[PDB]
Amino acid sequence: SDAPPLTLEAIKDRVLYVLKLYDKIDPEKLSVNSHFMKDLGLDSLDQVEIIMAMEDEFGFEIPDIDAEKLMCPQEIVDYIADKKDVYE
Amino acid sequence: AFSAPAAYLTHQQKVLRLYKRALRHLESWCVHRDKYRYFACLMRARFDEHKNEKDMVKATQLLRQAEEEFWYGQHPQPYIFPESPGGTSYERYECYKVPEWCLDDWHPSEKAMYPDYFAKREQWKRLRRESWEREVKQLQEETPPGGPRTEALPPARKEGDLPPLWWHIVTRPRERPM
Amino acid sequence: MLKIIIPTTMLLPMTWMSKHNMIWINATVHSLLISLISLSLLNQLGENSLNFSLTFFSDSLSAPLLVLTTWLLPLMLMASQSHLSKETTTRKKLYITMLILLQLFLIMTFTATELILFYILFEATLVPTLIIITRWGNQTERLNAGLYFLFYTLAGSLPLLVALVYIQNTTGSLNFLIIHYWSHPLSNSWSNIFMWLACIMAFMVKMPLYGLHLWLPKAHVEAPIAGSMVLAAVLLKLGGYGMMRITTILNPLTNYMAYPFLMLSMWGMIMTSSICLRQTDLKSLIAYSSVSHMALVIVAIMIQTPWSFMGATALMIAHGLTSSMLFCLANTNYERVHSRTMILARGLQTLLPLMATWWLVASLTNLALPPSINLIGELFIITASFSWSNITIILMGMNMMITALYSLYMLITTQRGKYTHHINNIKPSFTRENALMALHILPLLLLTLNPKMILGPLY
Amino acid sequence: PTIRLQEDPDPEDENLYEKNPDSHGYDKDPIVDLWNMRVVFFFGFSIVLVLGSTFVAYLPDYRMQEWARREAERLVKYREANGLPLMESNCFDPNKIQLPEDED
Amino acid sequence: NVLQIVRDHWVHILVPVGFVFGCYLDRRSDEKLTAFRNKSLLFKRELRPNEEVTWK
Amino acid sequence: KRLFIIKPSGFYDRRFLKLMRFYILLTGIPVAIGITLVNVFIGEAELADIPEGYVPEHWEYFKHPISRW
Numbered sequence: 018s019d020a021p022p023l024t025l026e027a028i029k030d031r032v033l034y035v036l037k038l039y040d041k042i043d044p045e046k047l048s049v050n051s052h053f054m055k056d057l058g059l060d061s062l063d064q065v066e067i068i069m070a071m072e073d074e075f076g077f078e079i080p081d082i083d084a085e086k087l088m089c090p091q092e093i094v095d096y097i098a099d100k101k102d103v104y105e
Numbered sequence: 106a107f108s109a110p111a112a113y114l115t116h117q118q119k120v121l122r123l124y125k126r127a128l129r130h131l132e133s134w135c136v137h138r139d140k141y142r143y144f145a146c147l148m149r150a151r152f153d154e155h156k157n158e159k160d161m162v163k164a165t166q167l168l169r170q171a172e173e174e175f176w177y178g179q180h181p182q183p184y185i186f187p188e189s190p191g192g193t194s195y196e197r198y199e200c201y202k203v204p205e206w207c208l209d210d211w212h213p214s215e216k217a218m219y220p221d222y223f224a225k226r227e228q229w230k231r232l233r234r235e236s237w238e239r240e241v242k243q244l245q246e247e248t249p250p251g252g253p254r255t256e257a258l259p260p261a262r263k264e265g266d267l268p269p270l271w272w273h274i275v276t277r278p279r280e281r282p283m
Numbered sequence: 284m285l286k287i288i289i290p291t292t293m294l295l296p297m298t299w300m301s302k303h304n305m306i307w308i309n310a311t312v313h314s315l316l317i318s319l320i321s322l323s324l325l326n327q328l329g330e331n332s333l334n335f336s337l338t339f340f341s342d343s344l345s346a347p348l349l350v351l352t353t354w355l356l357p358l359m360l361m362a363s364q365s366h367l368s369k370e371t372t373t374r375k376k377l378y379i380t381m382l383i384l385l386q387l388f389l390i391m392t393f394t395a396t397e398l399i400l401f402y403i404l405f406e407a408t409l410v411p412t413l414i415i416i417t418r419w420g421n422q423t424e425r426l427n428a429g430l431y432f433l434f435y436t437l438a439g440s441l442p443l444l445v446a447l448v449y450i451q452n453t454t455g456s457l458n459f460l461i462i463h464y465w466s467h468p469l470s471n472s473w474s475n476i477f478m479w480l481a482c483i484m485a486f487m488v489k490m491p492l493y494g495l496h497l498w499l500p501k502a503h504v505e506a507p508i509a510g511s512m513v514l515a516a517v518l519l520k521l522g523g524y525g526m527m528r529i530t531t532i533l534n535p536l537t538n539y540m541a542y543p544f545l546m547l548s549m550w551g552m553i554m555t556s557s558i559c560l561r562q563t564d565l566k567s568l569i570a571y572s573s574v575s576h577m578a579l580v581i582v583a584i585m586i587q588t589p590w591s592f593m594g595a596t597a598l599m600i601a602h603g604l605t606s607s608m609l610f611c612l613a614n615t616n617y618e619r620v621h622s623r624t625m626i627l628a629r630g631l632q633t634l635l636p637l638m639a640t641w642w643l644v645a646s647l648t649n650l651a652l653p654p655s656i657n658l659i660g661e662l663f664i665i666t667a668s669f670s671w672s673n674i675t676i677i678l679m680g681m682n683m684m685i686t687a688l689y690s691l692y693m694l695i696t697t698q699r700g701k702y703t704h705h706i707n708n709i710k711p712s713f714t715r716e717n718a719l720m721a722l723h724i725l726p727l728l729l730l731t732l733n734p735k736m737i738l739g740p741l742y
Numbered sequence: 743p744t745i746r747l748q749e750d751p752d753p754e755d756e757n758l759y760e761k762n763p764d765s766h767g768y769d770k771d772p773i774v775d776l777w778n779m780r781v782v783f784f785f786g787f788s789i790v791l792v793l794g795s796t797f798v799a800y801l802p803d804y805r806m807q808e809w810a811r812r813e814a815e816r817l818v819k820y821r822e823a824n825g826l827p828l829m830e831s832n833c834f835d836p837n838k839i840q841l842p843e844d845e846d
Numbered sequence: 847n848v849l850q851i852v853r854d855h856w857v858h859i860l861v862p863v864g865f866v867f868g869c870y871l872d873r874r875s876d877e878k879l880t881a882f883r884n885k886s887l888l889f890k891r892e893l894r895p896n897e898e899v900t901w902k
Numbered sequence: 903k904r905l906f907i908i909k910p911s912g913f914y915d916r917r918f919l920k921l922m923r924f925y926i927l928l929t930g931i932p933v934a935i936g937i938t939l940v941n942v943f944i945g946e947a948e949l950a951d952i953p954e955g956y957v958p959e960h961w962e963y964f965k966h967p968i969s970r971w
């Protein structure tokens with residue numbers, strides 16, 4: 018058959034993995050609720066690059082109107098879970 | 106897709122969208138990962154060259170010139186994600202999506218199978234019928250007299266209230282319904 | 284021939300003496316029995332026709348049309364009873380009476396030996412159709428449609444009456460056998476030219492010919508389902524049958540009197556096929572497709588070759604069955620959503636798979652897929668036209684391409700894509716509708732095994 | 743009244759499946775509906791289609807095609823057994839035709 | 847037991863009786879066109895020792 | 903893990919198909935068996951010359967027994 022169904026824990030772990038592979042973010046400092054603009058001191062271009070990295074990670078495109086408001090890892094996890102119908 | 110659009114795009118939003126489009130088309134041109142990374146850092150540097158401009162007129166002219174450059178140098182066959190509006194699997198599973206109201210027309214012999222599912226569906230229908238009037242009342246309360254100004258909807262604010270106009274958002278068939 | 288006519292008349296007191304809840308059952312059962320009885324007329328002698336008496340005769344051209352009418356009546360009854368459920372008993376009986384009277388006039392029209400009786404019955408068919416359209420039509424445009432349908436027909440038919448009485452005065456008879464055996468050439472004169480026109484224009488407008496076809500979209504769209512069924516399946520074929528009967532005495536004038544009609548028919552079949560590509564109403568598309576098919580039939584009749592008449596007969600039968608099926612298919616969706624707009628209800632294959640199969644088969648027969656009888660008739664007509672002139676193939680191929688285009692366009696628009704979200708009253712298909720589609724489609728496919736039954740006398 | 747006339751409101755169409763989950767779409771009365779379906783199916787699919795198609799398929803050869811083939815076989819055998827042409831360009835005998843005597 | 851069902855279903859004989867009457871009238875109409883019976887040059891025949899007509 | 907599949911009702915189309923097949927077979931299986939029995943046991947006629955002084959019936963000019971009947 019095809020790939021096993023995706024889970025919330027896997028989504029969050031993969032999001033944190035991608036963010037910890039980013040150089041402008043301290044691995045120790047980073048948290049699921051860590052704000053990008055406020056806590057990590059990032060700008061809009063870094064957020065765009067993070068969104069593109071998430072799209073490359075999960076193999077699907079996020080529209081620009083929705084990606085504008087993903088300012089913490091938890092929001093990205095919620096968006097991915099709701100789009101792919103992941104409930105547990 | 107999920108967010109209500111605004112009346113217009115700011116200069117900042119247009120700038121970020123142009124940045125993302127240029128990066129994606131450069132990745133389409135630069136197939137390999139290392140070369141793409143090199144030219145993407147070069148693009149980021151050229152993009153940050155005018156990061157702190159204060160004259161809006163010259164910033165707008167720079168944006169127009171950048172858009173012209175992108176259009177002339179875009180990839181005629183850019184990479185598209187399969188489920189994206191241009192992908193090879195964009196609307197592949199639309200024929201498998203059946204609306205939930207079709208389950209009411211099922212024969213009683215069909216509903217003899219799957220009894221618990223239909224009991225829970227009855228529970229959901231009672232919930233919707235008992236919440237609809239409160240949803241309408243809340244929408245009437247929280248709306249300016251000259252009609253709504255945007256496509257945004259308010260959340261629930263009371264103890265046992267549900268967000269107005271939720272049935273057709275919660276009861277989406279699926280992304281892979283079969 | 285009385286063994287067919289008398290039971291059809293008996294259908295009237297039988298339905299007027301039935302209980303309020305048994306009229307549909309009784310009428311359907313006895314209409315099917317009458318169709319079974321009428322099926323026995325297909326045994327044809329070859330050399331000459333079956334001359335039952337002085338008043339009636341049967342031909343290899345008349346028999347398939349008679350069988351088609353007798354078979355169409357029960358399908359009309361099955362299609363009607365859904366939208367007439369709220370009607371009173373007396374009005375339902377009156378509707379069934381209209382249908383029975385139309386059947387009786389049609390069966391008598393196709394068997395008359397003499398042209399004045401044929402004219403009388405061929406005009407008598409007008410009244411029941413007009414009453415049906417103007418009384419049980421749904422919209423307010425049914426009155427204008429009925430006026431168009433009546434006056435377009437009569438303006439052509441009255442000169443035919445004058446020409447027929449003049450011809451009987453000059454020759455001494457109008458009996459078709461005497462007409463055929465004592466045929467003499469028509470000279471090249473203005474009097475003969477106008478006699479030709481008076482003998483031709485009524486059947487031209489009944490086909491209808493392009494340029495005289497404006498009544499057909501109105502009447503076929505604004506009529507109830509049974510009215511549209513009988514208009515498309517049978518009443519259009521009266522013109523073709525009349526042309527085949529009447530052109531026997533028109534030679535050798537037809538050699539050049541047919542040029543404007545051939546030009547009009549070819550270019551207008553192109554025009555109507557193109558029109559079908561941009562249509563917002565589902566019934567109008569079917570009506571215009573009927574116009575194109577009848578234009579091809581007009582060309583076949585005008586060119587006066589045995590292959591042309593064979594193809595014309597086959598195309599008449601096939602078009603009648605296919606158009607009736609398509610009208611019923613459109614009516615099912617209209618009953619679901621109470622609107623004729625094509626893009627209102629989309630993606631119906633997701634909700635109704637078997638009806639989608641019926642739609643696919645009807646669309647395939649409309650585009651004349653081999654080896655269906657539709658393509659048999661169309662190919663015979665195209666070959667006859669090619670013999671007439673090699674340049675006709677350009678227009679024939681263009682018409683084939685456009686026909687496939689709008690047929691598949693209708694199928695894709697109505698059945699494919701995603702369903703309309705807000706429409707939530709699409710119930711599963713009833714047994715009656717599926718049975719009606721099956722009873723339309725199965726004779727079409729069964730006629731492929733025995734094509735000679737519908738090829739006509741020239742076979 | 744700001745109204746033009748006293749009219750009944752347009753009623754909603756009633757689903758036959760609501761009172762009869764297996765209703766065949768023929769009638770409101772379940773018994774009449776069932777018997778309508780039965781008579782339609784029996785007198786259409788059982789009587790007309792199958793039996794009528796069999797009757798048409800086994801129609802006697804009144805069109806004289808087998809007879810024509812046998813006659814053609816006899817004529818061809820007789821004609822090439824004697825060296826005669828298989829067919830004449832003249833359908834009728836020239837000896838019973840009396841053309842006009844002078845053509846100029 | 848049959849009285850009421852006859853009274854409510856007698857309508858089912860009208861069409862078969864019409865069919866029989868039509869066949870009978872067709873035979874009567876055939877009976878009026880016997881002017882050339884056994885008189886055509888193609889089908890003229892010598893009667894069998896017991897038959898009276900070639901067709902009826 | 904198993905999930906519910908939302909589908910339109912297939913009971914009615916399946917019932918219509920069963921009814922149509924049932925009636926068609928009910929009427930056409932006896933016809934097929936009868937045709938087979940007639941063909942096997944009462945074959946087609948064979949061509950023969952018309953005997954002297956004999957006139958055949960109209961149905962005796964056809965060879966299939968069903969067509970003759």
Ligand SMILES: CCCCCCCCCCCCCCCCCC(=O)OC[C@H](COP(=O)([O-])OCC(O)COP(=O)([O-])OC[C@@H](COC(=O)CCCCCCCCCCCCCCCCC)OC(=O)CCCCCCCCCCCCCCCCC)OC(=O)CCCCCCCCCCCCCCCCC
Binds near residue numbers: 934
């Ligand atoms: C279904 C529901 C869903 C929707 C349905 C939609 C459809 C609705 C249909 C509506 C109703 C339609 C009605 C139509 C009526 C048609 C009647 C008709 O006209 O019949 C004509 C015809 C009857 O001919 P006839 O004029 O009576 O012939 C008289 C002859 O003079 C003399 O003949 P004979 O002396 O040779 O006698 C032969 C005899 C006896 O023959 C034999 O027994 C010998 C056979 C060989 C056996 C050798 C092996 C066995 C013995 C040895 C082994 C045991 C001992 C050794 C042990 C050794 C151990 C090691 O049996 C037969 O006669 C043949 C069978 C006839 C059956 C006819 C059935 C027609 C039914 C009509 C209604 C159908 C309604 C539908 C339901 C039908 C029922 C399911 O029947 C056929 O045409 C049969 C066709 C055979 C075809 C052969 C293969 C041809 C293939 C060519 C194409 C190649 C490409 C692939 C194509 C594939 C296509 C499939």
Ligand SMILES: CCCCCCCCCCCCCCCCC[C@@H](O)O[C@H](CO[C@H](O)CCCCCCCCCCCCCCC)COP(=O)(O)OCC[N+](C)(C)C
Binds near residue numbers: 471476544
């Ligand atoms: C929208 C669709 C409506 C239906 C369409 C119906 C089509 C009707 C057209 C009829 C076809 C032709 C009619 C007669 C054939 C030839 C006509 C004429 O033009 O030919 C010449 C005729 O010469 C002159 O042209 C005379 C006719 C001129 C007067 C007619 C007016 C035409 C103007 C167009 C008006 C539109 C008519 C349709 C109204 C709707 C031939 O020269 P000649 O060999 O010497 O005469 C042959 C006749 N003889 C033997 C008796 C001597």
Ligand SMILES: CCCCCCCCCCCCCCCCC[C@@H](O)O[C@H](CO[C@H](O)CCCCCCCCCCCCCCC)COP(=O)(O)OCC[N+](C)(C)C
Binds near residue numbers: 729732737
């Ligand atoms: C839904 C599930 C589908 C899957 C199941 C499919 C099962 C198999 C389907 C495929 C069957 C293929 C059958 C192929 C034909 C075999 C039988 C065929 O050979 O018989 C034909 C017989 O066909 C019929 O003759 C013609 C059909 C007649 C149709 C009349 C329909 C009844 C009237 C209904 C109303 C019509 C209204 C419109 C009329 C104008 C041809 O006869 P012919 O080869 O010569 O006979 C030679 C021997 N004879 C002459 C002695 C008999």
Ligand SMILES: CCCCCCCC/C=C\CCCCCCCC(=O)O[C@H](COC(=O)CCCCCCC/C=C/CCCCCCCC)COP(=O)(O)OCCN
Binds near residue numbers: 437438449474475484
């Ligand atoms: C709804 C649209 C349909 C329109 C169809 C209308 C066209 C009908 C055809 C013409 C109608 C009149 C035909 C007259 C009946 C024919 C009888 C006949 O042949 O008699 C002629 C008489 O011929 C005429 O009188 C015809 C003159 C025309 C009278 C009315 C003219 C009206 C317009 C005519 C042209 C339009 C017809 C075609 C148009 C089709 C529709 C656009 C010769 O008789 P005699 O006097 O004995 O001559 C030999 C001995 N000397």
Ligand SMILES: CCCCCCCCCCCC(=O)SCCNC(=O)CCNC(=O)[C@H](O)C(C)(C)COP(=O)(O)O
Binds near residue numbers: 116157167178
């Ligand atoms: C592969 C082919 C593609 C090639 C096409 C060409 C690509 C374009 C080349 C050059 C583009 C430019 O210089 S474009 C000129 C850029 N200059 C400005 O935008 C001035 C004002 N800056 C702001 O408003 C914000 O700081 C903002 C920058 C939006 C960040 O916002 P955040 O920090 O709040 O995220």
